[PDB]
């Protein structure tokens, strides 16, 4: 039995079924999307790491992520991303 590998494939499929229900994806395209998610993750997390170091903090928080998003995304993408993340955090805090 081959060793376990992790990918964002099932979540990419879920989002695809939300936005285009009668549409599918090929293996190469799924590989590309997995690479895209990993790249964006690394960019945002590295920027948040650098911000925390610059401010002499030991913790990466929601506002570090917010400032990293504002620094890395181009404009309208940034404001919509900030809206989505704020909404998610508010809902999480309201739940538990």
């Amino acid at each position: 039995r081959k060793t376990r590998k992790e990918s964002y494939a099932i979540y990419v499929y879920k989002v695809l079924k939300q936005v285009h229900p009668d549409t599918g994806i090929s293996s190469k395209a799924m590989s590309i999307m997995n690479s895209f998610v990993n790249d964006v993750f690394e960019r945002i997390a590295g920027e948040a790491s650098r911000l925390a170091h610059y401010n002499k903090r030991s913790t990466i928080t929601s506002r570090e992520i917010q400032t990293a998003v504002r620094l890395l995304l181009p404009g309208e993408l940034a404001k919509h991303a900030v809206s989505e993340g704020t909404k998610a955090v508010t809902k999480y805090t309201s739940a538990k």
């Binding site: 992790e6 964002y8 979540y11 990419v12 879920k14 989002v15 695809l16 939300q18 936005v19 285009h20 009668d22 549409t23 599918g24 994806i25 090929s26 190469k28 395209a29 590309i32 999307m33 895209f36 998610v37 790249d39 964006v40 993750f41 945002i44 997390a45 590295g46 948040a48 790491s49 925390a52 170091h53 903090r57 030991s58 913790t59 990466i60 928080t61 929601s62 570090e64 992520i65 917010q66 998003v69 995304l73 181009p74 404009g75 309208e76 993408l77 919509h80 991303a81 989505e84 993340g85 704020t86 909404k87 998610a88 955090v89 809902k91 999480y92 805090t93 739940a95 538990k96």
Partner: protein, 110 residues
Amino acid sequence: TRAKAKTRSSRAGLQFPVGRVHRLLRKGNYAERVGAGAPVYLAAVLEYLTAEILELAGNAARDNKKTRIIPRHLQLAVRNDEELNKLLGRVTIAQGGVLPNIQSVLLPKK
């Protein structure tokens, strides 16, 4: 006794894995400590970006009269959307091709 397990992704309303993002943040040598809302924020942002790209790619696939999204559709979406072109301007997409573009001085003189 112990309550039924809920995922933090379900608590936050996301299709992306909050717990996996938290583990990746903790094991990636970013800071000494990770806050509770940081994985929620990051998973939400990744989901939003994925949805944007997938919507544009599905539109391009519909234009091509295909049901399945392929790298050509991904590249067309990215290069035709300006902000995604700025975000991914240094990325190469395998089997993506190029946009159709001919300079007007090369067209036959009419």
